[PDB]
Paper text:
To further investigate the mechanism of C–S cleavage by IseG, we determined the crystal structure of isethionate-bound IseG at 2.4 Å. The P21 crystals contain four monomers per asymmetric unit, each exhibiting a canonical β/α barrel fold common to other GREs. The sulfonate group of isethionate is coordinated by Arg187, Gln191, and Arg676 of IseG and one water molecule through an extensive hydrogen bond network. The conformation of isethionate is further stabilized by van der waals contact with Phe680, Ile190, and Thr310. The three sulfonate-coordinating residues (Arg187, Gln191, and Arg676) are conserved in the sequences within the “IseG” cluster of the GRE SSN, but are absent in CutC and other GREs, supporting the proposal that the “IseG” cluster enzymes are involved in sulfonate degradation. A 98.5° rotation of the C1–C2 axis in isethionate vs. choline results in the pro-R hydrogen of isethionate being oriented for abstraction by the thiyl radical.
In this work, we report the identification of an O2-sensitive isethionate sulfo-lyase, which catalyzes C–S cleavage of isethionate via a radical-dependent mechanism. GREs catalyze challenging chemical transformations using the high reactivity of the protein-based radical to initiate catalytic reactions, and recent studies have yielded several new GREs with novel catalytic chemistry. Biochemical characterization confirmed that GUF was indeed an isethionate sulfo-lyase (vide infra), and we renamed GUF and its activating enzyme IseG and IseH, respectively.
Author numbering:
A (entry chain B), B (entry chain A): 31 to 828
């Protein structure tokens, strides 16, 4: 059924598809000078008319952005200058490799790359950064490799995570969006330069893009119909005919049944992939809510069954599992180990009126996740103080499957923060999970720019080596904070750290200022803009830097929180306060990676650590967090946004660690940094509840300039076994909620399974582990990232 | 000790003191034409120089606003036109009578009244309301009596509740404030008219009022020294010397000890009473926080003891119990049965950084309340999702004393609402309870105008009688919505009610627009403004309508929620859907107050009722609430404020009830309406937990335009007996917090105690009951308010 589809692409390397990039380029190279949203819309039409449409074997819904099997899509507007080396490197890349046929290689070199030579966003961004910033961003003059210090993330995705107002599609259809746009055009003053230049072309872009997705849908209806006529098996012939009927109706017209709603949404989400490379892949919204009217009505009218609806969802996810986010740059790839994806599916939470939103579909999605073997969908469960008992129990049972699903997002942290930044309560209460851990208001959010990922572990190294890093030798990178062995008090060391920290923040905000102004000259999002109230009201593409009435919620990342906290905690305690070792002795111990210095290494590992509800380390964490909250509060208004400190790592803590030498917390050189706001590996020796408490102690709830923190916690199977274990997990989630923590997600595994899977990859090919907001096959992960997963403390008693 | 003090005025009618009114008037009549804040400051200086200062027997702190015993104060600027009848009527008034000596009456007629003739705020407001509004406001052309329909509340208190930044006094002292203002004057441009007219006179008033309270304090220090020098008892002589020393220092200078902090805060609190008639009497803030540093240091340094500190607290509250809020108009008196008072004292909650704020002083205040027999202080305990267990347990034990202490205010409802209205998280988290149930940010709140109390039970009556009310005969009051016996569907009845409801809202908002602009011409508050950051920054008196950067949080009252919901529920169910009776039968039964129609009365009492978690009624309640939230959201911006629906009754449900005839829910003519957002009398038949859910069901969490709801619940002693009963209350409080409800407070009493005390007041004269955010002696209450307290369901289980 779905296992039949699943057997068809099992254990196959994804291929790179080129049709979208080819026809995008054929259109774009013919429209130079025209308004970018209009060019994008004409290209989407050109794609809609010329790219291959697929009706896939055994499927009940149709729509692809690429070829049979697992595939990815090319985005030359973003990083087309990487196409040459991606041809050479992608098939053999150690992590997340992609195969490329010779035929598709020829189109890239011959039909795609030439136009984009000298026109990509990454070429423009590399030239746009001033030298002081460039040295902290890239390792070479053409910005082909990051230095993993002040890491910009705008050059390996079109935008950050996004959630469409899919329900708008289901209720109105794209023909309705188009007619609104025509009426708006008719109301313009034809004498007005602003109407003629700022209003008309945007609205014309909306009209075309509506015609584009509809024409694309109707080409499926035709293909399905032609197949139905030649189909000999009656059962399949009725299904093909059903496809021809539904796709002739949606997404042009509002959906009439649950099946149409799935296909309408599926069409919208696939075309979204064709339009742009959304960060983490475009997300899916509160499906258990906006599907509910269709599900409820069909269920009552015998049109659908509990099993039949569950079959259609599985049809949707096997398709999602065939689309792989393609990162052709080495920075993008190392941020996204194991074919990383986060097409967040939100279930549960509250309605816009503050009532609990659990419905039967909520439980179906949970069950759907528990019985679909792939690590799809990216299930995110909303928690609030009145989350029902049965719901939390079912959340706990899903967690105890061991695959890491679902991740938990806390209404009690998001809703107050979002109303404090201008959201009506209805908008905040109705938020969707997006990407790793983010909250989105699909008609109020307007910010789309990838933000800095900052390796603050390197900032600490630059204190130890007075502006330099061992990885980069004598390169003049950071502030000349002075010879650390010349510091007489702890306060001088801390100030040294503070100076490096503000240098990185300062660097990052200059990056974002340039990025936010630059992106609008390279990226447009006409289909996404047509589903956004403010875009339509003010005639502005989503990627415009400022949109009236919008709220801009963006990010800068703190990487290595636990690593830095413990290192600083050790230095303060062991070097300055207890004077158990001198600065030179510590530095000497670091310089030789503790080889021959195992005694100091153990001594350093004995100081107070983050994640133990220990105020000695937790006060250091709070002061480090305060630096980023207060910086954001002060300097974000200049950028017309909320640029908030966030602790969501992707898989960057691996490459960020690969460039940071041995640190005062006892961590070995070049190994992964601590993840998100989790405790540093094996530093939580007081149980799992103290991790939640240290996360609380390390925040600054007196100010609003904060976003998510990603928290990874691992239980052993014994610790959560049985009804008593389910009750503990449920209660632990209630405490997480009460503490106003943003996110939590769990692995449930024995250490020996991870070790065995390293010692025998072929045997444990299907082992799935939760990494950072997503799950992947353990055997696809690099040794360094495996070591991150292994060294995470497994809690046995909770 | 304090029992000796309390024995001296036990069971005595308070007297009306005139000194403040005399010396206020002597100054004001000499300063006509000057800017009002400067005049007020000069008036307060004149009082400071001429009014009697008292060193009271057995006391350890000093400061009075009137004569020995229980006393009240006159504020002729507010309602001086009532002085004539207050001379005749107050000593014999049935509720809350005040005695007045013949000499004090002579001061009033001869030295106070003449100047204020034609100058009072009430005279000005009465003339300023247009005829359409006046008919709904007052029952006579000089506005001497309310009609208890659209009741304005600005005319019987200077302002609404208020909380000073007392901690600023303790930490800075008033000399610092004066010096700040002097520098600000020195920095002015002497050529600038705006500096000369808008800045200098405001700052000159701050200088004077700082000198005024300091001079007033030093006269206490002088008198105490003179008494100590003649004191024969060594113990008492030391107390006088301590008083002489402490009062020469505070509030001029920052406090140095716990004793000084109490005396400084007391001075500020008493002088505030001299400055104006704050609503509910000025409130006291989070004393367990800003007293904590002094308590901890002295306690550690052997300077203070738990018992001595508790003694100093009791000295403050016996003083508070001697100050009685004086309402001379009959409206003010009927709103404030039994000498109602709400000098809110806030304990517990969260710090400005979101950490739990329980400390040892928090528990001492609880113990302090449990061992002081009077219904003082007005203890308010803040609740949040992390209220500690021991804290909730001691709160429950205090509740189990049966006196109504403490009232519960829920962070989880207040804090999101306040940051959504512009408060930083630190300001919101640090809020103080003020008055009945309100939250105050002492340097961000700027709104001070009394709002409407709207008798929506009367609005329903105008549907039953097509714009008229039985109490007022043929007086053409409301909208002519038609003969109710002509309504063919429920929707017509509902629409008629909606029309009257909006008439009352429109009326109240015209009142507030006129009131908010009028008050600045009659009231000024120099001492309160000198403690407010925004006042000092922008040189504006607190009672200015608009103050830059301020947040204006005001109110309009819905009275009779339960009464109206159930009446409508009965009409919807019994007349229109089940057709168990005709409209003519219901009206006939109502007009004769059910006499001869007892069966109809019984049938009407059987419909679904609010407070039972019954969506049939709760959905009506939710829709009525939505009417007022949506109206406020739309039309408050015009007023430059948040004019939010609130359900806090004072004791106005008695006078509001006394003008409403028999209602469709079975309530008898002229009896009390339901209180706050509590269930209507005896309508809650499904336990106390369903009241909380119905309060939740009847709200609209999707919008912010909402303020407090006062909730009264009564348990019998049996329900809460023993350790299990304490745990049940703790558990019930968690559910109250989880549901984001604003307020709850409890009576614990047997119905028979209420009946026995009615049949024999002398025997049960000291019985204390929780009424509406405050507690009072049951025997001081009118029969109508006693019947309200008796009819509240006493719950045996939860």
């Amino acid at each position: 059924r779905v296992f039949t589809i699943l057997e068809s692409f099992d254990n196959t390397r994804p291929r790179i598809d080129v049709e979208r990039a080819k026809y995008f380029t054929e259109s774009m190279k013919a429209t130079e000078g025209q308004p970018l949203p209009l060019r994008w819309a004409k290209a989407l039409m050109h794609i809609a008319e010329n790219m291959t449409v697929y009706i896939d074997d055994h499927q009940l819904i149709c729509g692809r952005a690429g070829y049979q099997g697992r595939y990815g899509v090319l985005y030359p507007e973003l990083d087309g200058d990487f196409l040459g080396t991606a041809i050479e490197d992608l098939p053999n890349r150690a992590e997340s490799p992609f195969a490329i046929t010779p035929a598709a290689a020829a189109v890239v070199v011959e039909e795609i790359a030439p136009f984009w030579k000298g026109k990509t966003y990454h070429e423009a961004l590399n030239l746009a950064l001033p030298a002081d910033v460039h040295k902290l961003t890239y390792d070479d003059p053409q910005g082909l490799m990051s230095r993993f210090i002040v890491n910009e993330t705008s050059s390996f995705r079109s935008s950050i995570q996004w959630v469409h107002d899919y329900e708008k599609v289901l209720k109105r259809g794209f023909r309705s969006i188009k007619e609104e746009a025509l009426e708006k055009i008719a109301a313009l003053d034809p004498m007005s330069p602003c109407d003629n230049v700022e209003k008309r072309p945007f609205l014309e872009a909306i009209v075309i893009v509506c015609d584009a997705i509809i024409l694309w849908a109707k080409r499926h209806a035709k293909l399905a119909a032609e197949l139905a006529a030649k189909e000999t098996d009656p059962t399949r012939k009725r299904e093909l005919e059903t496809m021809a009927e539904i796709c002739a109706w949606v997404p042009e017209n509002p959906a009439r049944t649950f099946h149409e709603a799935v296909q309408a949404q599926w069409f919208t989400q696939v075309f979204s992939r064709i339009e742009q490379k959304t960060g983490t892949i475009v997300s899916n919204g509160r499906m258990d809510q906006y599907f509910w009217p269709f599900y409820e009505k069909d269920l009552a009218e015998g049109r659908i069954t509990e099993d039949s609806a569950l079959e259609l969802l599985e049809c949707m996810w096997v398709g999602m599992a065939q689309y792989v986010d393609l990162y052709i740059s080495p920075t993008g790839g190392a941020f996204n180990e194991g074919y990383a994806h986060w097409e967040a599916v939100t279930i549960g939470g509250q309605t816009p009126e503050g009532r609990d939103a659990t419905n039967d579909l909520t439980y179906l999605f949970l069950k759907s996740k528990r019985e679909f073997p792939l690590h799809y969908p990216d299930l995110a469960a909303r928690i609030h103080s009145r989350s029902p008992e049965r719901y939390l129990w079912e959340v706990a049972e899903t967690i105890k499957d061991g695959s890491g699903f679902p991740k938990l997002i806390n209404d009690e942290e998001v809703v107050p923060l979002y109303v404090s930044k201008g959201a009506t309560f209805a908008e905040a209460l109705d938020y969707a999970v997006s990407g790793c851990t983010e909250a989105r208001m699909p008609n109020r959010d307007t910010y789309t720019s990838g933000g800095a990922y900052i390796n603050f572990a390197a900032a600490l190294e630059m204190v130890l080596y007075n502006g330099k890093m061992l990885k980069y030798g004598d390169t003049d990178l950071g502030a000349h904070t002075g010879d650390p062995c010349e510091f007489k008090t702890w306060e001088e060391f801390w100030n040294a750290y503070v100076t490096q920290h503000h240098l990185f923040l300062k660097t990052a905000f200059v990056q974002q200022h340039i990025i936010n102004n630059l992106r609008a000259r390279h990226f447009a999002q006409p289909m996404g803009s047509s589903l956004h109230d403010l875009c339509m009201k003010h005639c502005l593409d989503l990627h415009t830097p400022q949109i009236p009435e919008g709220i801009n919620l963006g990010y800068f990342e703190y990487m290595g929180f636990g690593t830095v906290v413990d290192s600083l905690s050790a230095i303060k305690k062991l070097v300055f306060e207890d004077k158990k070792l001198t600065m030179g002795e510590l530095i000497e111990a670091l310089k030789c990676n503790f080889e021959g210095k195992e005694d100091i290494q153990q001594l350093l590992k004995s100081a107070p650590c983050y994640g133990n509800n220990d105020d000695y380390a937790d006060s250091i964490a709070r002061d480090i967090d305060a630096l980023s909250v207060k910086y954001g509060r002060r300097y974000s208004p200049e950028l017309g946004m909320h640029n908030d400190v966030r602790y969501v790592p992707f898989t960057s803590h691996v490459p960020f660690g690969r460039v940071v030498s041995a640190t005062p917390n006892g961590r070995k050189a070049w190994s992964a940094l601590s993840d998100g706001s989790s405790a540093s590996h094996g530093a939580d020796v007081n149980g799992p509840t103290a991790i939640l408490q240290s996360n609380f102690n390390s925040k600054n709830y007196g100010m609003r300039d904060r976003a998510a923190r990603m928290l990874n916690i691992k239980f052993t199977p014994k610790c959560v076994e049985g009804e008593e274990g389910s009750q503990k997990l449920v209660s632990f989630i209630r405490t997480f909620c009460d503490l106003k923590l943003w996110h939590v997600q769990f692995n449930v595994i024995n250490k020996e399974t991870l070790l065995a899977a390293q010692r025998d990859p072929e045997k444990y090919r299907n082992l799935i582990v939760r990494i950072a907001g997503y799950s992947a096959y353990f055997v696809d992960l690099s040794p360094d990232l495996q070591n991150d997963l292994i060294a995470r403390t497994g809690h046995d008693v909770m």
